[PDB]
Design a protein around this nucleic acid. Structure first.
Lengths: 520, 51
DNA sequence: CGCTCTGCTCCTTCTCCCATCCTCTCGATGGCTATGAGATCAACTAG
DNA sequence: CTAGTTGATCTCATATCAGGAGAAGGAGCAGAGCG
């Protein structure tokens, strides 16, 4: 067995299956349990982050630590796609636990509240989804849960969403978030995550914004004065120090030599808008609607939707062999044709993502038009058919391409079968495409994988790219290291409607540290 | 207290364009700034912005 | 012997009010505030 | 009974000069008790 401080013994066979970093994780989680604090497992996805929770809870139950005689009833909130995945995981890596699913699919086939009571009495592990948490805050928050793990916990990133409040109604201190990216757009998201795990650490939300978000953000802008750069640097370091104990973020560089992943690539392709595509885009930017949006008369979102659609396909207006969703009508589809052609000739499995769902349909009809055997998976595909679809695609190489909407396509699914990944459509959220591309390059990917980001030069999509770069740098400034380089490329204004196509410390260590921080 | 529709009738012009009363436009401004203040107190905003 | 508590003046805001009723013409202004994905659920539809 | 489909239906996420009159308050100040 493996032994830690007070009484934590995790079975040796279980421990040996783990890696070194996963073992560190188990120790970290138990140290938190000792503190009675929560934490964020911010391991980069694919690093077997889920296995760490299994090991830790197993060890805790096995050690029979002393209200509760070991591990009490616990609730797992995870995105709807991965519930049965978690059930499977508990079942293999530790059969003894009872892992009840709370879902329409489920396995209970009675009233749900009976199941809640059953687990809270027999001390099982109730898996559920964020929806059923939002909808039964009353029922669920009446049973003294022992652990409240949220998988892909970033969904609580909005402090005012209903689901966030519901999740923050749970009472136990042993709150855990498993989130490959616990910060996606701005620090308001970070504060929200910390306020679930550790309700006071970062202060109130107003105070956090005032003290951290404003300064840290202002240090990223190109035009920021150096003074403000240094305030940002200070605040970023303070933030890292504040969040260090409670966030365990192992990127895939401190473990790569100790884990042996294959090569990864991140090529970008600046697609060129075709003639019809160019015409529709050039017209719509010149349209009165865009002009009115620039004047602020109505919502900007409408314009952004329209522009993104245009860059994505001329589905504003539809134009034999020129039916809706025709490939040659849009340049990005031409590029996709060439890439899938060469790759199908390479006998290689592709993973094509799209932020949209109806565009996923146009891609689907395209892949009919070709001889490419695919399998499509979006929010409309049934949840019960979800995990078997993933397993099917991973088990056999007959299925060539795998259309995916990024919202269900990301978020914890393992897709090692695919080799090539192409991100067809950008998002305003860097995390979306990041998790999308990271579906392949995980543990068990025994083959090289490259990531292609298809983008329309000079159009809205490049400006969205700039947004998500600026976001990524902001996340880097506070997660990986505060010495980020300032995003000098753009001023990031509302001129994104244009077409510009190519062509004991002994009190001296303390005071020294203080003087360092306050010298900036 | 926002009055009923009788106190601020939306008179229809010759066509279909429904013109709203002055009270309705003012209540629109009030609800706009009230929602704006509600979100600014709920989410990130400076003290001077809320002021 | 300075401190208070009047209370008089003067100014200064500051607000309100300005007949009834009737006829006609003429000019302006008369807006939406959007989109889409995912999850639940309950209705059918087939098996 | 059981998947599959299909509406609703909800949630969440995405972005930068020819007025006049009167009343109320405040300020300055004389002066009177008075401790």
């Amino acid at each position: 067995d493996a032994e830690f401080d007070e009484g934590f013994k995790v079975p040796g066979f279980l421990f040996k299956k783990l890696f070194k970093y996963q073992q560190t994780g188990v120790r970290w989680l138990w140290e938190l349990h000792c503190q009675q604090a929560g934490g964020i497992l911010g391991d980069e996805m694919g690093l077997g982050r889920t296995i760490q929770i299994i090991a830790f809870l197993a060890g805790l139950s096995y050690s029979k630590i002393r209200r509760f005689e070991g591990l009490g009833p616990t609730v797992i909130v995870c995105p709807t796609t991965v519930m049965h995945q978690w059930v499977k995981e508990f079942h293999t890596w530790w059969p003894p636990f009872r892992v009840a699913i709370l879902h329409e699919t489920g396995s209970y086939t009675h009233k749900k509240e009976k199941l809640i009571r059953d687990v809270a009495h027999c001390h099982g592990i109730l898996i559920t989804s964020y929806s059923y948490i939002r909808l039964m805050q009353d029922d669920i928050s009446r049973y003294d849960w022992h652990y409240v793990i949220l998988d892909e916990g970033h969904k609580i990133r909005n402090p005012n969403a209903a689901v966030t409040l519901a999740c923050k109604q749970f009472r136990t201190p042993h709150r855990i978030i498993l989130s490959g990216s616990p910060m996606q757009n701005n620090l308001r998201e970070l504060w929200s995550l910390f306020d679930f795990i550790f309700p006071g650490k970062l202060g109130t939300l107003p105070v956090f914004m005032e003290q951290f978000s404003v300064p840290i953000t202002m240090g990223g802008y190109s035009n920021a004065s150096p003074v403000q750069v240094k305030t940002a640097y200070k605040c970023a370091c303070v933030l890292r120090d504040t969040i260090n104990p409670y966030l365990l973020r192992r990127m895939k560089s401190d473990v790569k030599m100790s884990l042996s992943l294959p090569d990864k690539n991140e090529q970008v392709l600046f697609c060129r808008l075709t003639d019809e595509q160019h015409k529709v885009y050039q017209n719509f930017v010149d349209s009165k609607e865009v002009y009115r949006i620039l004047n602020g008369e109505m919502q900007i979102f409408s314009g952004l939707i329209a522009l993104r659609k245009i860059c994505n396909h001329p589905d504003l207006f539809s134009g034999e062999e020129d039916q809706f969703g025709y490939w040659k009508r849009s340049g990005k589809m031409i590029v996709v044709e060439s890439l899938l052609k060469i790759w199908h000739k390479q006998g290689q499995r592709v993973l094509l993502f799209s932020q949209s769902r109806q565009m996923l349909d146009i891609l689907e009809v395209f892949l009919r038009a070709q001889k490419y055997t695919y399998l499509k998976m979006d929010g409309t595909t049934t949840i019960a058919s979800r995990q078997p679809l993933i397993t099917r695609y991973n088990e056999d190489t007959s299925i060539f391409v795998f259309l995916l909407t990024t919202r269900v396509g990301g978020l914890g699914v393992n897709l090692t079968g695919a080799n090539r990944v192409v991100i067809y459509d950008p998002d305003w959220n860097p995390s979306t495409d990041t998790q999308a591309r990271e579906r392949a390059w995980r543990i068990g990917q025994k083959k090289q994988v490259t990531v292609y980001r298809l983008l329309t030069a000079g159009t809205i999509e490049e400006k969205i790219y700039h947004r998500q770069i600026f976001k990524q740098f902001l996340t880097n400034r506070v997660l990986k290291d505060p010495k980020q380089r300032r995003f000098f490329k753009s001023n990031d204004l509302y001129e994104l409607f244009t077409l510009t196509s190519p062509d004991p410390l002994a009190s001296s260590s303390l005071l020294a540290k203080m003087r360092a921080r306050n010298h900036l | 207290p926002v009055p009923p529709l009788s106190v601020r009738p939306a008179v229809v012009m010759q066509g279909s364009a429904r013109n709203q009363d002055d009270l309705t436009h003012k209540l629109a401004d009030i609800v706009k700034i009230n929602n704006q203040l509600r979100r600014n107190e709920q989410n990130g905003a400076a003290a001077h912005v809320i002021a």
